[PDB]
Symmetry: C3
Subunit: 184 residues, 3 copies
């Protein structure tokens, strides 16, 4: 299989692969055009995001700066909002539900390395997809790690570092994040 | 009450309100002009901030990038310094005393959402002000949450997530931050 | 002893020193040029980094935006990689070995203030060097504090706030970070 096929499937892959490199340059190009848009260019922003992302709802809004790796692995639901200076390393799929509110400086990662140093120095990496449900609030400066599923109506406290699955209707905070409050 | 009056009073309000939208655009405009200034343009930087913020002392300096929501809700004391890549969501007042040193990547939030998903989905938000005393050091990458007061001479360790009031002369650290020692 | 000599030696120094302000301006100029480079301008980026940093290996790559204080205090080994939106406050030396992987939003600090409220209000600062071994993975959004040394083959979990030395072959995580796993 190609490096891109391995990447998308969650297997070890070489990022220096020519096809993957070109796709990263294309994401970076669209992100650069996005980050240069004036604060009143709403339609132009919407247009750029729908071209960047794999799929969207009717509307979405993101404050510059924004960063991502590929673009096409990000799928967001209706009425998506992400505040200033976010980063989504979408080596694998990032799938987000409807009515997501994401605060500023939020980082969502699918990209990872082997823990063993010889395995890591091979220069092979992989990814684990991230799934975020409907009606999720992600507090500012939270970090969502690869492989994490967040249930519907979950609240992520600001600054929380989420290393495991978050149950639906739960509030999590801390590092590593733990359930603090059950909503019902 | 206008939506702006409800916002400033800590009441639920609609950020889509036309007046608030214009005010947010005007703030992003000034922030855009600021973030584009050269590293040598000290006087232009000062004037931009004194127009952006509600009040200042004689001298202040902020390393780009900087981000805020309204600008006019930010009040800083003498010799204010904020290092690279700060965010202040100033839906309500953010009042900071004299001789503050704020490290890079620091986020201060006054904006918040209802916890209930349906109430949150209404689009209505609210805020709680943040008050920071004199001679405070906020270490790099700290998060200061809505409604928090930080006493005079307090130190916020780098990376601390501050969820509750910080006593004067206390050092706090962790997520959630706790008092780790006392000063002076 | 000039303010620069005291800065480098780890003593109290005044950052407003004219020589230091010039050096800080020079660094920001080079950083501004770097951050404006296109995603396809690999050779331009390499040249700029090799001009900005104190020493490098043959190959290195950093995703904009990047921030630093002086540049010349940063020394990186072979195949250095740093992802989006990193900050390195290099008031004192930051020495990093070969094959380092640094995630996005990583902050490495050498700059610090007196904790004592009287001393800090002098406005004088100091620094403590940071040393990072070979084959280290620093997870995105990690914070590395002044005077910390990280041993060879160590892994810093995403979001970890590192306040003390990390042993070779350890995985650390949390805030303050602690050893969570041993590799060797």
């Amino acid at each position: 299989k190609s490096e891109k096929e391995k990447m998308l499937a969650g297997h070890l892959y070489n990022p220096a692969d020519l096809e993957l490199v070109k796709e990263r340059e294309r994401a970076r190009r669209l992100v650069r055009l996005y980050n240069e848009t004036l604060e009143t260019e709403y339609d132009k922003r919407t247009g750029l995001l729908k071209e960047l992302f794999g799929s969207t709802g009717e509307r979405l809004f993101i404050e510059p700066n924004f960063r991502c790796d590929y673009g096409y692995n990000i799928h967001v639901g209706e009425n998506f909002f992400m505040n200033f200076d976010g980063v989504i390393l979408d080596v694998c799929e990032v799938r987000i539900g409807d009515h997501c509110f994401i605060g500023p400086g939020v980082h969502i990662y699918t990209a990872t390395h082997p823990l063993d140093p010889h395995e890591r120095n091979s220069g092979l990496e992989y990814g684990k997809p991230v799934v975020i449900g409907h009606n999720v609030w992600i507090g500012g400066r939270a970090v969502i790690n690869p492989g994490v599923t967040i249930g519907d109506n979950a609240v992520i406290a600001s600054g929380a570092v989420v290393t495991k699955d978050v149950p639906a209707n739960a509030v999590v905070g801390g590092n590593p994040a733990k359930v603090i409050k059950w909503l019902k």
